Ligand binder design. Sequence first.
Ligand SMILES: Nc1ncnc2c1ncn2[C@@H]1O[C@H](CO)[C@@H](O)[C@H]1O
Ligand SMILES: Nc1ncnc2c1ncn2[C@@H]1O[C@H](CO)[C@@H](O)[C@H]1O
Ligand SMILES: Nc1ncnc2c1ncn2[C@@H]1O[C@H](CO)[C@@H](O)[C@H]1O
Ligand SMILES: Nc1ncnc2c1ncn2[C@@H]1O[C@H](CO)[C@@H](O)[C@H]1O
Ligand SMILES: Nc1ncnc2c1ncn2[C@@H]1O[C@H](CO)[C@@H](O)[C@H]1O
Ligand SMILES: Nc1ncnc2c1ncn2[C@@H]1O[C@H](CO)[C@@H](O)[C@H]1O
Lengths: 237, 237, 237, 236, 234, 237
Amino acid sequence: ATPHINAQMGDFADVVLMPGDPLRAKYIAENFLDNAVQVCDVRNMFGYTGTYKGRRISVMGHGMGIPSCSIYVTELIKDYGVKKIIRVGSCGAVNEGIKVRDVVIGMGACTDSKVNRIRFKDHDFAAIADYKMVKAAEEAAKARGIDVKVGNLFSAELFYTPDPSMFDVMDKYGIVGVEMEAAGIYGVAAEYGAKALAICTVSDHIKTGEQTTSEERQNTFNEMIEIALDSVLIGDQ
Amino acid sequence: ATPHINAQMGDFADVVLMPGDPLRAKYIAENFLDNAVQVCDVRNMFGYTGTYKGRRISVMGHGMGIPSCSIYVTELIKDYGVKKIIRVGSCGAVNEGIKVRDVVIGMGACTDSKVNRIRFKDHDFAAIADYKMVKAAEEAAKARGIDVKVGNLFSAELFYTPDPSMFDVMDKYGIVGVEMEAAGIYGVAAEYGAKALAICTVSDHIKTGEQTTSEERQNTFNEMIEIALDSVLIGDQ
Amino acid sequence: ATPHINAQMGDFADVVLMPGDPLRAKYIAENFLDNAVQVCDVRNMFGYTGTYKGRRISVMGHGMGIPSCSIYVTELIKDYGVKKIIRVGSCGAVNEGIKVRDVVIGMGACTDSKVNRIRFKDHDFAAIADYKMVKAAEEAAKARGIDVKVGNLFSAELFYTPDPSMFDVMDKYGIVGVEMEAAGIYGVAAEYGAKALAICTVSDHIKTGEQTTSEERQNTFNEMIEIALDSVLIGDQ
Amino acid sequence: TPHINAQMGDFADVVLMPGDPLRAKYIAENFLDNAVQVCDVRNMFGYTGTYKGRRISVMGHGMGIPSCSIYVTELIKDYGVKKIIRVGSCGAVNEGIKVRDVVIGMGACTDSKVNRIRFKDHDFAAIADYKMVKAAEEAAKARGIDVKVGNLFSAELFYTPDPSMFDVMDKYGIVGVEMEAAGIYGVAAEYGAKALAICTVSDHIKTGEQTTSEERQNTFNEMIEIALDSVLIGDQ
Amino acid sequence: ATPHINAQMGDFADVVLMPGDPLRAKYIAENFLDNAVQVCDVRNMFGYTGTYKGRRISVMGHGMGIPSCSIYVTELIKDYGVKKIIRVGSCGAVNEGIKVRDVVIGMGACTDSKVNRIRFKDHDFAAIADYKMVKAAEEAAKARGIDVKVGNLFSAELFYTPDPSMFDVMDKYGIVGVEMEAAGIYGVAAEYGAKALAICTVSDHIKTGEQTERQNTFNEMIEIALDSVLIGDQ
Amino acid sequence: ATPHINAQMGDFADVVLMPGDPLRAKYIAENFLDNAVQVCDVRNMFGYTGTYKGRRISVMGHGMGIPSCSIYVTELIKDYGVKKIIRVGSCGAVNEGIKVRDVVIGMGACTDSKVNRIRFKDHDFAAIADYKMVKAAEEAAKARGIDVKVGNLFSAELFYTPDPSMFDVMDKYGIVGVEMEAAGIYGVAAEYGAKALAICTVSDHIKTGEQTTSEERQNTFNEMIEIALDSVLIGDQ
Ligand SMILES: Nc1ncnc2c1ncn2[C@@H]1O[C@H](CO)[C@@H](O)[C@H]1O
Ligand SMILES: Nc1ncnc2c1ncn2[C@@H]1O[C@H](CO)[C@@H](O)[C@H]1O
Ligand SMILES: Nc1ncnc2c1ncn2[C@@H]1O[C@H](CO)[C@@H](O)[C@H]1O
Ligand SMILES: Nc1ncnc2c1ncn2[C@@H]1O[C@H](CO)[C@@H](O)[C@H]1O
Ligand SMILES: Nc1ncnc2c1ncn2[C@@H]1O[C@H](CO)[C@@H](O)[C@H]1O
Ligand SMILES: Nc1ncnc2c1ncn2[C@@H]1O[C@H](CO)[C@@H](O)[C@H]1O
């Protein structure tokens, strides 16, 4: 009943996992959730609701970029009663302390977008995740024997950046991964009084160009999804 | 062979029509082009290539927002040799001189995004369409007896704006419609040396809120697509 | 009587051609208009009114720079009822696609001035000409065998720029000519609800170094004025 | 160094920092064992002692981003300090936060231009070190104190010419207004160290709630104990 | 010869007085200088050179606005060897401490232009006059019994401002007068290593509405400027 | 009392000299004023009131940086009735025309702080001293046979700057010394309707690293203080 989501109140759980690709949302629903049913498909932005260890959880794509994910997250919170959003994505690393296949958590998200300046009187709004969600994801990873790197993501406006020198600045300031949405999701969560978190797997190294096999990448993605879902159960305690 | 488009050089025509919704690209391909074949589907962002009165033309969604459409348009130009991009979308009107169902052409596109400042040393880049494309579209509309309003669109960053007072500023400055991509597409076209145009139909009036029936809405969209396709042929003369 | 123009309502036609030099306004009035009379001379900024094929047309200098031309154009519109402004100027080229002696039209005008940010809540206002005026001038030129380059002008704040590296950015982004007024005139036209256009002749090339003579310049200037005047009649329909 | 008259080794690798050098003196004398003064240039007192056997330093940072940046930069680059815990006071702007509450700035918003100077005029999210935040929250839980973790706002002008900004801070959930965390976090990122800002809410900017001097001192004491306990948890 | 000035090196003195109106430059040269000769007239922007008590002094219009005066002042400094520029203009008042007919001096000039940010890495450049020139003008005025108001001018980009509320901010911050050039002239003087000063007469009040006497006050300003040149030389 | 000053109205003279270091305020009070009594000590920011040649004068530290000195100066003006503030400090030189041990006066103060943009609608506020105070200080130095250089200081935000290239821009633009407070003090004086001046001695040459003995340094500081105190008496005439 919203312009970008053809669902009804109650169709989504109060916690929604969101990759950018709607086909990754389909993959998560089919392989990690039990009895997941599709709840939306406007603009092919697929969303599903099923259970994980008996707990109701939804998964839906958010598209690429701050403006796209802002629309979906805003509607989920204000029109569907969603309380927590976990972006589950991929990112490029810029620092030598971070390696391909690492799992990173954006406790903060830097950005070159103007959206938070539009909201915050042109001052610096520190786009941050919800602390308890970060803690739950780090504890879930520790229980699985995975060491997550917690720090700042960089949410880029231009994937094909006209300023590649900025990657060196990100490296110097310890950015853990480059993606295009966390700062926008965090801005919406603060504006609408909800909670969010962005967890990402490092799929490529922007500075080194390091590569891996498709199998290795899929394995890391799977590990990250399990951590996100386990974190929901820890968060419920 | 690109990260967001699973196609190969030659799969796309040198002219691509792009609505934001991939399902609208599917509708255009099936109802306005002859023998259209799907050429891409990564992230469900459907793209097709067929013919219009014998002329090869492609149609593909671009997603929502400047960062999303920037990725697709940049890849089409630099990896697929696309020369002209015609965004075919919907927009909201803010001025009394514009009415619901009107067809508007963005000769320019204002914006609250920082992408053009990132490209243009933080000065004011006037994000403009290619003049010959604007002229071809206006002449195509004239041949069909369809009135068009040529002026500035406003490409917004936040659909759910925290600053609705900006709509009054847009009104005063003669903005013809509010959408979320034209300024970004125009910036990419200038950066990569290609040509673009954004043609939109007014679906809602942000101030009054005029109303229509589904049929009327569909009829106006069809009019916009015929103008756009006809403009390609005129542009080739 | 305004502070910068010592004329009375009705002294100016509803269309005014404006070069920066008042002596060029004089040359236009005396050699291209019939029965031209001087209507203003405050600060030596000469303005005249005469006829072209029986149609009333005015010509007046606007001085140099955005703040200067803004004063004159605002007064012409708000105090003298002027509806259309045609800047008839000179500019320097920065792109190799543009040659000296070429006639360029600013469908848009980029700038490093803060005037449009002051008007548009610090967002990006695309400073644009009126489409119908652009089309009339392009058609007038085409009828005379002159191929006008329609694109973005760059209206500079500092003729003696402390940042010459910006010329390379202008070149990359396709700027057709460098002058110091179009973006300001376009901003005034949008603010006051009037229409404007800037047509310029390329006097020199900033990138390659190509220069011109006084004779070549004079010949090209005459052509520009003939195009501008014919465009007024086309615009009248 | 130009602002610290000490020598390498005089400071522990963890330094607690209130803005007032006299609060640093109070902490050294009442919470640390055998604390000795290690610096006094510009009256910015710093001390080193032990807490439950662990070496810990405490030093004032002055008021405002420029002042605390000088001291924190010197501590990290010239004295080998690895972790900085600002232990201060702040004003609340949101109804969800009460006077006497203990807040932790996982992030710090600001109207300063310092991070823009560092980060190509883009938005650097000034953040604390996660493990330090977690240790402080766990230390507070062990003491039966509920901490509110979120964004501080590090102001440039205490006597702001724009009081309407407090309403924007309230709307965006800022937990407290102080004048340093965003600057400390920017230095920590630039110099590769770790920081955290924990503050007690001493006043409510929106409501004006009052409390006795005794109540404020008790809350300050509680917060210092949490910060020191957090160092021990962080060492594990 | 330069693109905007059709003179030759040596035609201008090392000190140039500049009003915005070229006709005011003409008036100054004919009534306050001896043996004044016109040295330039491109775009009708008249410039002259004559003497004041035997000392060579030039006078030339600068046009309206920062970009316009920047072109003329830059060329005078870099192509004609000018060392000092004295803008002699008119301005509007916004503060109740300033009255119409007052003579004000911009020791600083605030602005809404982006030119000094373009020059100064987007930081805040305080556009200032040369101190010794300010002092010379203030002392010249004091000797004549004229009490000059020395402070900040505001050099506006838009005469017909879309933001009139900014006049209340100028008033609160003590701006002494609103004109459209001083911050640009000061920016050029710093960039090129020269010296400048902007002295203006208050033609009217923006806050109270008091209107205006102009000729008499203008004459006084020019007398102060000229005497300030000789003091500056000593 | 005020939050940062434990004094009462009347404890401070109407003129206050302010070094950044409270121990330098103590030194000035004990060695240059007669019968100075300490009037405040909150946060160890010592302030004193005594007489100089019979004239009541106060001296108090202001701490380091714009935000710190802004608090103290604002409270002195609005709560303690102070009319004139004379910052007496040290600075670093960037220009060859300035030498170590020189005494410089900030008629203006440039800055990279955002405080004056926050006050002045994001435009350029020229942070300036009060002219009569500047003149009094220059005349006081002349009486003592001490040459002074009057120009623009640069009030830095980051002592350990991440952008040392800005020192070359400061040099080119004639900056006479680099400190961290004058622009802030000047902004407060304008906002609160008071008067201020910053006089500094060059302690180091950021470009050459010029050097001296402690005795020479102490001698130059004493010279600056004598000039400052003498300027108060001249200012009263
Ligand atoms: N290096 C990267 N830069 C930007 N976005 C990235 C990168 N790697 C992965 N992504 C993610 O995938 C998309 C871009 O391919 C974005 O939506 C973002 O979430
Ligand atoms: N009023 C509107 N504001 C913003 N985008 C709009 C509007 N109306 C239609 N759109 C279009 O549809 C999407 C937002 O629903 C955007 O991708 C944009 O192209
Ligand atoms: N290269 C150029 N840069 C700026 N303005 C130019 C240039 N060439 C011509 N002009 C025009 O002439 C004037 C500057 O000589 C301006 O008013 C502008 O209209
Ligand atoms: N309301 C407040 N606003 C700003 N700083 C505050 C506030 N309350 C406490 N502080 C702290 O105390 C000092 C200002 O009194 C700052 O250094 C800051 O750390
Ligand atoms: N109120 C005013 N605002 C702007 N410029 C003014 C004002 N009064 C006088 N001037 C001067 O006259 C011109 C505008 O009339 C400018 O060039 C400026 O020097
Ligand atoms: N080179 C310098 N850069 C910045 N501040 C300086 C410098 N030299 C002296 N200072 C002064 O001393 C302090 C920094 O050491 C500041 O408060 C400032 O007043």
